[PDB]
């Protein structure tokens, strides 16, 4: 940094050294002034000037070293407090730029929130005509067309429910609630939601509830079971699903055994990945595939472990490993 200081003040260090040389020249030809008696003046002046530069360098090249050290990585307040006017001007420039950047970020966030709110308004505004649709529909007498319109209405309902689950999982973190739930009403509601579609696919239900109580949240687990059941049913055709739930030790375990095509053992660990589509059957393209990803990401707050034992050509055994009730003592109490 010595080079920078000796190059910045290039003219002031010569505006002085010109005068000693001028004196030592005027005191070489004029006979009234001596030489060995002006070398003394020169020597004393040089000593003072050298000491003055040494004491000036340290005080002057400090703010810029701080600026260089801060740069743009971190410690935005690392710059030293200004003392001289020019440093004050630089400091005002820096503060103005940072403030403007903060304003832009805040405005971007507000615009995004407004867009999300408008999307909320629209999705409610299109949910309500679906309720009107259901109430108008539930009046005919036919069977085949009734069932047809019924399950296409149901698939519209499930895709809309999926988008609603996405919007609510955007902020799920602030809606935790732990209490006892009854699995039988939830399973009955899920079956009722699939009554027409299960009848169309001709798949029965065999419910065996050895366990009684579970300790989790209602809606997210309900939708997880919903999508698992849909996947299991669309993996099967005219087959009976063995739904056995037993209290293995201190934890609740729900096993959904099916006799359908199942999942290939290579793809058994890869069912929860992003955007998985089955190319074996063209009817599997209707599946979004994001439901499994959101289910697995929403299972972490619920602490529910999903165990899958599927064989291709045999069926899929979807097993839910509910966490131990004692493990919730550190969560409910705290």
């Amino acid at each position: 940094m010595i080079k920078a200081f000796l190059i910045e003040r290039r003219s002031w260090i010569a505006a002085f050294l010109f005068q000693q040389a001028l004196m030592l020249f005027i005191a070489f030809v004029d006979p009234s002034i001596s030489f060995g008696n002006v070398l003394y003046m020169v020597y004393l002046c040089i000593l003072f000037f050298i000491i003055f530069l040494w004491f000036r360098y340290r005080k002057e090249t400090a703010f810029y070293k701080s600026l260089k050290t801060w740069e743009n990585n971190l410690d935005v307040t690392a710059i030293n407090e200004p003392e001289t006017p020019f440093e004050a001007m630089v400091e005002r420039s820096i503060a103005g730029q940072t403030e403007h950047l903060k304003q832009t970020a805040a405005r971007h966030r507000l615009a995004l929130e407004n867009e999300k709110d408008e999307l909320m308004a629209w999705i409610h505004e299109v949910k309500t005509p679906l309720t009107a649709m259901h109430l108008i529909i539930d009046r005919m007498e036919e069977k085949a067309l009734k069932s047809q319109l019924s399950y296409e209405w149901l698939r519209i309902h499930l895709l809309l429910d999926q988008q609603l689950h996405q919007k609510r999982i955007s902020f799920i973190e602030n809606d935790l609630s732990v209490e006892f739930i009854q699995l039988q009403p939830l399973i009955f509601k899920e079956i009722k939601d699939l009554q027409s579609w299960c009848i169309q696919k001709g798949i029965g239900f065999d419910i065996q509830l050895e366990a009684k109580e579970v300790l989790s949240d209602a809606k997210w687990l309900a939708f997880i079971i919903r999508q698992l059941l849909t996947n299991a049913v669309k993996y099967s055709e005219a087959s009976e699903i063995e739904i056995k739930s037993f209290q293995k030790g201190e934890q609740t375990q729900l096993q959904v055994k099916d006799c359908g095509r199942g999942i290939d053992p290579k793809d058994v660990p890869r069912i929860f990945d992003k955007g998985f589509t089955s190319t074996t059957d063209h009817h599997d393209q209707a599946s979004t595939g994001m439901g499994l990803y959101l289910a697995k990401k929403a299972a972490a707050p619920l602490l529910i472990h999903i165990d899958v034992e599927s064989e291709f050509g045999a069926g899929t055994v979807f097993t839910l490993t509910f966490p131990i009730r004692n493990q919730f003592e550190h969560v409910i109490s705290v």
Binding site: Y40, Y43, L44, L47
Partner: protein, 635 residues
């Protein structure tokens, strides 16, 4: 961790905080080197005067080392005391005392010896300038040379090594005895003691303003008066610091009610309480600064008037006692191409009485009022006045006499002849001398009498007190020209140094008083610097004791600008009081006895005081900066 890095960080922290200590060390070493070099320089033998020459430089060196030693010892006893917490902590952690001594004494032998090495190397550069400054004042034409004088190197190393040994001895005792592991309404007494200080200060001033007056007129009744004045003023100062500051400040505070600004709460909450704690320090500072200013002013006053007093002591440019010497000097001048206006005037010496004309007291006798010796001259010799019979006119001013001998208007003057006495009267007082001081005794003026009475006085010729030479042969010179050849002719005329010249009695006085003024000025500068540093080193502790007060005051909304604005006035009051009291002391010391020295005051004294104040205000300016650094970090 490792000891060494701890020592090094401590040394950097010390070097930043105490920079006035290092500056004072470098300055003092430089001055000692310069004086010892100048003592041995052979050109110091050109200074010709009554004083021995290079025997005054030795006295200056001896006096200088005492001030430097006192400053150093006191500074280090201030410094050690601010490390009691660290000593206690190191003793509590478990490490012994002979392990703390080697930490806190191995970072002073670096600072001290580095500054000592800088001082010698920067005292070689300034010696020629010091010598030339000396030669300019005493008016000598010689050559100054640059040489090292390896005696002064030895004589500085030895002195400062001795002082450092003393510092180490003084630190060991404090460390040893501090092993304990130990981590407001005014009274009646402080009212009487407060009034007695003001009463005792002014008694000295009043007795001083008389001195050489109608009383104390005895050789042995003077030392009592001087002792009384000095003792009174010193004791009055000491008791003025311990109680009269509290009295006045208490009155000022309990005459405002409760409505106080921030300037007054910052000032009067510390001037009342901590100024009294330092009363054996401000006393010394004030009295010694008074000595410095007063002595320098008197020495300077006795320097301008050298030419006037030389022109008055000898009336003519040369004064002669023998006819043959005068005639041979004139013969030498004849081929000197210089025309000299020779004049002669006989002098008759007698005794008179003018005790009636004295307006003072009979105690102002200075000899017998009726039998005091005077010199009588004719009227024809004087070319400026023409008196008549029965009238006497005094000649000359002699400013000393006007302050001791009081003269009234016309009265009766009796001439004590052998068998007669012609009465005369005093017409007026002249201002131009006519006779060299050898004839006219000490300072008695010369009378003017009519020539008609002179024809009887020269017929009487009372042969009782007549001088050996009743003649004033005195040779003049032509207009202002080259007079040095005439002077050297004069000194080769006389070999028994019994002839007076105007140019040589105006050089001895100049040389002597120039030397005294040089020495006194340098000692005054040294004392100024050391006192400023000591007064700076106590405001540090005073500031660090009010750190909590700043914090509390800053939660009520007061911003740093107001705090610093109050601190400015506080520092003004803290640093101005000793200076003002010292200035008053010096002014009343100079005015008492200036007429004994010269005939010019208020030209030198003003500039001396201005120089002192201007160089003293720097240390007051440099303390507001430390107060700012303390204020900022007390959020």
């Amino acid at each position: 961790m490792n000891i060494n890095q701890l020592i090094l960080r401590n040394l950097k922290k010390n070097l930043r905080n105490y920079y006035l200590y290092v500056f004072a060390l470098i300055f003092s070493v430089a001055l000692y080197f310069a004086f010892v070099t100048l003592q041995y320089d052979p050109a110091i033998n050109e200074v010709k005067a009554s004083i021995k020459g290079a025997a005054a430089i030795k006295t200056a060196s001896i006096l200088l080392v005492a001030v430097v030693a006192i400053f150093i010892l006191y500074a280090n006893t201030i410094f050690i005391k601010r490390r009691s917490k660290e000593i206690g902590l190191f003793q509590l952690i478990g490490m012994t005392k002979h392990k703390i001594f080697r930490i806190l004494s191995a970072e002073n032998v670096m600072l001290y010896f580095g500054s000592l090495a800088i001082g010698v190397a920067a005292g070689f550069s300034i010696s020629k300038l010091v010598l030339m400054i000396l030669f300019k004042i005493v008016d000598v034409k010689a050559d100054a040379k640059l040489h090292f004088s390896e005696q002064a190197l030895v004589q500085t190393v030895i002195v400062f090594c001795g002082i450092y040994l003393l510092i180490m001895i003084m630190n060991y005792t404090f460390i040893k005895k501090q092993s304990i592991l130990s981590l407001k309404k005014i009274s009646f007494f402080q009212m009487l003691i407060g009034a007695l200080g003001i009463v005792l200060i002014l008694t000295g001033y009043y007795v001083s303003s008389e001195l050489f007056g109608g009383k104390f007129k005895t050789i042995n009744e003077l030392f009592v008066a001087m002792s009384f004045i000095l003792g009174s003023v010193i004791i009055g100062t000491f008791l003025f610091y311990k109680g009269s500051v509290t009295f006045i400040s208490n009155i000022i505070r309990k005459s405002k009610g409760g409505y106080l600004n921030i300037s007054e709460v910052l000032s009067l909450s510390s001037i009342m309480f901590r100024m009294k704690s330092n009363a054996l320090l401000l006393t010394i500072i004030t009295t010694v600064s008074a000595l410095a200013i007063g002595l320098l002013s008197l020495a300077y006053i006795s320097y301008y008037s050298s030419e006037k007093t030389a022109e008055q002591n000898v009336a003519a440019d040369f004064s002669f006692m023998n006819e043959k010497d005068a005639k041979l000097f004139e013969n030498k001048l004849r081929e000197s191409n210089i025309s000299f206006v020779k004049k002669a005037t006989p002098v008759l010496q007698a005794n008179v009485d003018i005790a009636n004309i004295m307006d003072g007291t009979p105690k102002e006798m200075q000899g017998d009022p009726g039998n005091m010796q005077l010199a009588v001259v004719s009227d024809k010799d004087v070319k400026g006045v023409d008196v008549a019979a029965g009238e006497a006119v005094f000649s000359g001013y002699t400013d000393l006499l006007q302050k001791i001998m009081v003269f009234k208007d016309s009265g009766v003057i009796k001439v004590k002849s052998k068998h007669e006495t012609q009465p005369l009267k005093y017409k007026g007082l002249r201002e131009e001398f006519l006779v060299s001081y050898t004839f006219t005794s000490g300072g008695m003026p010369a009378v003017i009498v009519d020539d008609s009475l002179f024809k009887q006085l020269d017929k009487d010729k009372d042969p009782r007190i007549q001088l050996a030479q009743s003649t004033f042969i005195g040779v003049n010179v032509k207009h202002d020209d080259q007079m040095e050849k005439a002077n050297e002719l004069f000194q080769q005329v006389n070999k028994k140094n019994e002839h007076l010249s105007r140019l040589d009695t105006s050089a001895a006085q100049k040389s002597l008083f120039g030397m005294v003024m040089f020495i006194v000025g340098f000692l005054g500068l040294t004392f100024l610097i050391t006192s400023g540093c000591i007064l700076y080193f106590k405001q540090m502790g005073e500031s660090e004791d009010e750190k909590p007060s700043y914090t509390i005051l800053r939660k009520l909304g007061f911003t740093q600008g107001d705090l610093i604005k109050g601190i400015r006035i506080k520092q003004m009051y803290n640093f101005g009081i000793p200076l003002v009291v010292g200035l008053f002391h010096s002014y009343f010391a100079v005015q008492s006895g200036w007429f004994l020295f010269g005939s010019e005051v208020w030209a030198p004294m003003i500039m001396v005081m201005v120089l002192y104040t201007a160089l003293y205000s720097i240390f007051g300016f440099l303390s507001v900066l430390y107060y700012k650094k303390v204020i900022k970090s007390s959020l």
